Structure formats: C-alpha cells, structure tokens
Write an enzyme that holds these catalytic residues in place. Structure first.
Site, PDB file in Angstrom:
ATOM      1  N   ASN A  18       0.828  -1.189   0.000  1.00  0.00           N
ATOM      2  CA  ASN A  18       0.000   0.000   0.000  1.00  0.00           C
ATOM      3  C   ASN A  18       0.872   1.252   0.000  1.00  0.00           C
ATOM      4  O   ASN A  18       0.415   2.343   0.331  1.00  0.00           O
ATOM      5  CB  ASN A  18      -0.912  -0.021   1.225  1.00  0.00           C
ATOM      6  CG  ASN A  18      -0.140   0.138   2.540  1.00  0.00           C
ATOM      7  OD1 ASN A  18       1.031  -0.274   2.655  1.00  0.00           O
ATOM      8  ND2 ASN A  18      -0.803   0.723   3.549  1.00  0.00           N
ATOM      9  N   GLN A  19       2.132   1.095  -0.390  1.00  0.00           N
ATOM     10  CA  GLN A  19       3.070   2.217  -0.408  1.00  0.00           C
ATOM     11  C   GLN A  19       2.824   3.202  -1.535  1.00  0.00           C
ATOM     12  O   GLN A  19       2.056   2.943  -2.451  1.00  0.00           O
ATOM     13  CB  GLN A  19       4.511   1.707  -0.512  1.00  0.00           C
ATOM     14  CG  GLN A  19       4.845   0.635   0.493  1.00  0.00           C
ATOM     15  CD  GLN A  19       6.272   0.149   0.396  1.00  0.00           C
ATOM     16  OE1 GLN A  19       7.212   0.927   0.521  1.00  0.00           O
ATOM     17  NE2 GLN A  19       6.443  -1.153   0.181  1.00  0.00           N
ATOM     18  N   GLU A  20       3.486   4.341  -1.442  1.00  0.00           N
ATOM     19  CA  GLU A  20       3.401   5.385  -2.445  1.00  0.00           C
ATOM     20  C   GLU A  20       2.024   5.650  -3.031  1.00  0.00           C
ATOM     21  O   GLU A  20       1.843   5.637  -4.246  1.00  0.00           O
ATOM     22  CB  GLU A  20       4.386   5.074  -3.567  1.00  0.00           C
ATOM     23  CG  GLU A  20       5.818   4.926  -3.078  1.00  0.00           C
ATOM     24  CD  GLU A  20       6.578   6.244  -3.007  1.00  0.00           C
ATOM     25  OE1 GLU A  20       5.963   7.280  -2.647  1.00  0.00           O
ATOM     26  OE2 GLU A  20       7.800   6.230  -3.301  1.00  0.00           O
ATOM     27  N   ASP A  21       1.058   5.899  -2.164  1.00  0.00           N
ATOM     28  CA  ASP A  21      -0.291   6.199  -2.598  1.00  0.00           C
ATOM     29  C   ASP A  21      -1.057   5.106  -3.342  1.00  0.00           C
ATOM     30  O   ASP A  21      -1.623   5.333  -4.410  1.00  0.00           O
ATOM     31  CB  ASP A  21      -0.287   7.488  -3.418  1.00  0.00           C
ATOM     32  CG  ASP A  21      -0.276   8.730  -2.545  1.00  0.00           C
ATOM     33  OD1 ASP A  21      -1.240   8.925  -1.771  1.00  0.00           O
ATOM     34  OD2 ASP A  21       0.688   9.514  -2.628  1.00  0.00           O
ATOM     35  N   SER A  22      -1.064   3.913  -2.768  1.00  0.00           N
ATOM     36  CA  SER A  22      -1.811   2.796  -3.314  1.00  0.00           C
ATOM     37  C   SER A  22      -2.324   2.140  -2.045  1.00  0.00           C
ATOM     38  O   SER A  22      -1.663   2.196  -1.011  1.00  0.00           O
ATOM     39  CB  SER A  22      -0.914   1.840  -4.095  1.00  0.00           C
ATOM     40  OG  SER A  22       0.095   1.304  -3.267  1.00  0.00           O
TER      41      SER A  22
END
Ligand SMILES: [Zn+2]
Ligand SMILES: [Zn+2]
Ligand SMILES: [Zn+2]
Lengths: 65, 46, 33, 134, 266
Positions: free
Chosen positions: D1-5
């Site tokens: 769920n990194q970098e805006d996901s």
C-alpha cells in the site's frame, strides 16, 4: 437502492433488519443508535451498514412501466 | 403470445415491420422499447 | 401574427412545463424530481 | 500500500463493496437522400458488397437490432444498417471493441424527418479490481 | 482431559464465546482462519433470468441471491459439481430453487428469502432451505416491485468455500484475544501520559491474573489461552462452525501426509 444482504466488512446478514429498523423508528419511536443495538448489530461495521443505507429504490419505484 | 415492441408510457405490446410508421394505438408517444429475448440469459452469482 | 423562428427554452424556467409540475407530476413525466 | 496505493478487503469486494453499474448507448439514423434513396435497419449478408464487419451479426434480429437480453462482447454487431449506392454497402454499429456486457434497452423511434431513429444501451457491472482508483 | 482444552463460557444459536486453552497461538490462529475461509457450504451460484421488470438489474439481483444464506447441514453429503459426473449439474451435487413475484397489490409488493421454492429432489437431506431468523419469518428482502412488475428466475446452489468466494463463508466474524494484561509484551501501548489509564481494559482481564509491579519481566512466558467468540450466519450451527473448522483443518494436515506417501513409491 435496497438493503445490503450481509455486511461488507464482517459478514453478518443484515438483509432482513431493514424493515425492523425502520419500524423501531417511526412507530416504537426509539433513536437510531439504540434501534440498531436492539436489532443485534453490535460492532460498527455491521452497525454503519444499516445506519447509512439510502434506500433509493423507494423512489425508483415511484416511476412507471 | 409473442411480442416485438412496447410503449414507454402505456406499456402495451405491439409488434410491427417496415411501412406502418413507429407510433402506437391510442397515444402517439412515438417511442417504443424492444422487449426482452426469448433465449433466457444466465448469470454468475458472485 | 407571424412566426420568427424557435427559441430554445431552459428547463425549470417559466416557459418550461416543469416549472409548475409537482413531485408526482414529475415522476409521471419521467423527470427526476 | 506504499506510495499512494491501498490494500482493499477482497471479501468485502464480494459482499458487494464498491461495485458499480455502467451503461453505454450507441445511436443511429436512416439517412435520406433528397431525390428518394434511403438506408435500412436489417441483418445483411454478402449480397454483392462484402462491405461487412469482422464481428458476428447473428445476435441480430431482423429489425436489425438486438433483443434486450442478449450478451454482447468483442466486436459483435449491435446494429444492422445498409446503404444502397450505384448492392449492399454496410452501415452497422458494433460494440466498442474494448468493452462488453449485456444489452439493456433498445429503443425504436422516428425523427422529425420521419427517419427511423434507434438507440441501444449495453449494461455492465464493474467490480473493484487491483488497478482501480479511489 | 488430554491436550488443548475448552471452557465454553456463553453460548447460543448464533455464537460461541469460549476459552480454548493449552494450545499454540499458531494453531489457535489456523483454526481461526479455517472457520473464516474453508468450511464447505451451499450457496446460490447460478441464476437464469426469464423475466425481470424490476427496478434493479439482472446481475444486481443475482449478486444478492448468492449472498442469501442457505441450509447447509448435510452439505458434506452433496458433491462438488466439479467432482460430480453429470455433464453440468444434478440432484447429486446441486439444489435448484425457483423465484417468482408479481406486483399484485396496489402497493409495493416485497420479495423475500423465503419466496425461494426448492425444485430439485433433496434425496432427503437438510440442504437449500433459505435460512430465516427474521421475526416475521421472511428473511432477507431480495427486492421490491410496483404495479405490474414481474420477476421469474431459477437458481442453482452448488457446494463451495470462502476462498472461491465470500458467499460461501459461514463465518460472519470471529473474536480473538489473548494475554489481556500485556505480559508477554507482544505490544507497546501508545500513549500521552499513562498507558494503563488511556487504554481500555478488556472484559477478558477478569478471567486472568493481574500484573503485580514488583515482579521482573517473565521472558520464558508463552501464549496459552485464547478468548475466542465464533459467530455464525446460520448456514451452519454455531457449534459446527467450530467443529467442522477443526475437522477441515484436520483433513488439510491429513493430505500433506497422504501425498507425502504417494511420493514415497518412487
Ligand atoms: Zn459488519
Ligand atoms: Zn402508446
Ligand atoms: Zn452433479
């Protein structure tokens, strides 16, 4: 837009509780927060489920053919 | 027994073909829908 | 006395039928209230 | 769920979470030619022209349309039309190649110029899947 | 008795608050999962639509029909259509319900879970009965219709589990906690001033011995005792959601041995 059979998050059916809920409201004149509780809806997932549904269908029906 | 079209308002089965315009018996409302298929459609239930 | 063309009307304006209509009136016209 | 996901609960996606309907409507007319010549809403076949389409025509009834229950996909033909010019040059409308779904409501009517006017509408349910935005 | 052990506190038709103790967090967890995702069940998985003048769309309605819980007692004696030998399906692997509604009334006619009419032979066995717990005895409101709105379907329930899809889960929710008095120090309470004052104590604190400041940290500690509360949707008897869980997980470990044998041959 019809009552969600079963709650998204956890699983508990909620398909039936609609009419009940809408009743402990206008008749038995209770406040939502409680009505839900009466209906067995403990945890907020199933709880927000009923408390937030917008039964649009009722308008949908008011149309015609 | 068998239908082809329908009216938007006076939901009444019609059935036509070329030449006989595209209106309805009684109220003009020249729309008309096209009634379902006979070969029933199936759905996944997920 | 004489016709000088057509003027596109704005919905919900006086000149528009819907201007007067009511809920049930509308649902029957198939217009979302 | 990194970098805006984000990670979404699959189970919830099944119980109906965030699903949505999608409709789309193809439209068409029967062109007139001043000194009487017109098109046709029919289900053609060869007959000189060969100007057909790769996709299937079979889902076509004889009014050159599809019954509201029929399931369409790839480049199936949704509308049957033809133009006579000096015998059968095509004018049929196929379902948008990317899309697919189920015919929902076909409508037949006439336009000011007594033209045969038709509008089709295919319907689909779209489910939240990995690449989707929220 | 012998090994891992229970102490069912409360209990009912839709719940089983109990105290599984003398096990392994690992094993407690596994049980916890299996209950949620791998216990067979019967669910509507095919819907033919002959007519639908409803305000809702074909697949909209189908989605729900599959969500409708069905009687899955003798589910374990119904085969998986995949396994069954019938080109497609049969009474040996599927239940077939029917549904039909007509705006007869002059006022919004409802359609209910109850209105499904089994039509295949159940070769005598508890299966496919729309599970109803609703007061008026209707259960799950499938949909509504006005004047002459109709709706003629046909459903085919098939076996299946939670992994393949959520409608096959008899789970619903599953409470699970352990070491209510942070002793194993498996956490690190966030706080502003006092962790203890700021973080609510669980009803499970009572059933267990308090801290006692003086005492040094017990590193040899280990996780025993898990306060679990296995709900249920009805497709299956709360108790069963647990046994059948214990039983499936059991078969799973089983196969590993079995396969680990067919392998020995060569
Ligand atoms: Zn919930
Ligand atoms: Zn008419
Ligand atoms: Zn079979």
């Amino acid at each position: 837009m019809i009552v969600p059979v079963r709650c998204f998050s956890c699983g508990k059916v909620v398909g039936d509780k609609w009419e009940s809920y809408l009743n402990l409201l206008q008749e038995d004149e209770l406040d939502e927060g409680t009505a839900l509780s009466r209906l067995g809806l403990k945890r907020y997932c199933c709880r927000r489920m009923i408390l937030t549904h917008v039964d649009l269908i009722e308008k949908f029906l008011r149309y015609n053919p | 027994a068998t239908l082809k079209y329908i009216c938007a308002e006076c939901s009444s089965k019609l059935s036509l073909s070329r030449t006989d315009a595209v209106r309805c018996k009684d109220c003009g409302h020249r729309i008309l829908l096209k009634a379902r298929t006979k070969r029933l459609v199936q759905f996944e239930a997920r | 006395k004489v016709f000088i063309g057509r003027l596109p009307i704005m919905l919900r304006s006086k000149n528009c039928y819907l201007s007067e209509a009511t809920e049930s009136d509308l649902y029957k016209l198939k217009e979302c209230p | 769920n990194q970098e805006d996901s984000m990670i979404m609960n699959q189970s919830s996606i099944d119980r109906g979470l965030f699903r949505s309907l999608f409709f789309r409507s193809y439209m068409d007319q029967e062109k007139k030619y001043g000194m009487s010549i017109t098109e046709t809403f029919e289900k053609p076949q060869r007959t000189n022209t060969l100007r057909m389409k790769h996709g299937t025509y079979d889902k076509l009834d004889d009014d050159g349309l599809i019954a509201p229950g029929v399931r369409v996909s790839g480049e199936d033909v949704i509308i049957g039309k033809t133009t006579p010019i000096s015998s059968k040059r095509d004018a049929s409308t196929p379902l948008r190649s990317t899309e697919n779904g189920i015919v929902d409501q076909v409508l037949v009517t006439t336009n000011q110029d007594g033209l045969k006017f038709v509008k089709v509408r295919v319907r689909t349910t779209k489910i939240p899947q990995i690449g989707d935005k929220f | 008795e012998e090994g891992p052990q229970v102490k069912i506190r409360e209990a009912s038709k839709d719940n089983v608050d109990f105290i599984l103790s003398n096990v392994d967090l690992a094993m407690a967890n596994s049980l916890r999962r299996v209950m949620i995702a791998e216990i067979p069940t019967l669910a509507i998985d095919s819907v033919e639509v002959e007519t639908n003048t409803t305000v809702l769309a074909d697949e909209f309605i189908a989605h729900r029909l599959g969500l409708i819980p069905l009687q899955s007692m003798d589910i374990e004696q119904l085969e998986y259509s995949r396994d069954c030998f019938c080109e497609d399906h049969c009474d040996k692997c599927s239940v077939v319900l029917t549904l039909q509604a007509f705006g007869e009334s002059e006022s919004t006619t409802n359609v209910y879970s109850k209105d499904l009419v089994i039509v295949s032979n159940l070769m005598g066995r508890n299966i496919g009965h729309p599970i109803i717990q609703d007061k008026e005895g209707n259960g799950v409101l499938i949909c509504k219709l006005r004047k002459g709105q109709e709706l003629k379907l046909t459903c085919v329930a098939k076996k299946g589990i939670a992994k393949e899809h959520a409608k096959w889960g008899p789970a619903a929710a599953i409470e699970f906690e352990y070491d209510p008095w942070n002793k194993l120090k498996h956490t690190d309470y966030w706080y502003e001033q006092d962790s203890a004052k700021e973080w609510p104590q669980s009803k499970n604190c009572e059933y267990e011995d308090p801290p006692n400041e003086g005492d040094p940290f017990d590193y040899k500690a280990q996780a025993d005792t898990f306060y679990m509360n296995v709900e249920s949707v009805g497709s299956i008897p709360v108790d069963q959601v647990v046994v059948r869980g214990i039983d499936t997980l059991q078969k799973k470990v089983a196969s590993i041995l079995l396969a680990l044998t067919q392998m020995d041959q060569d």
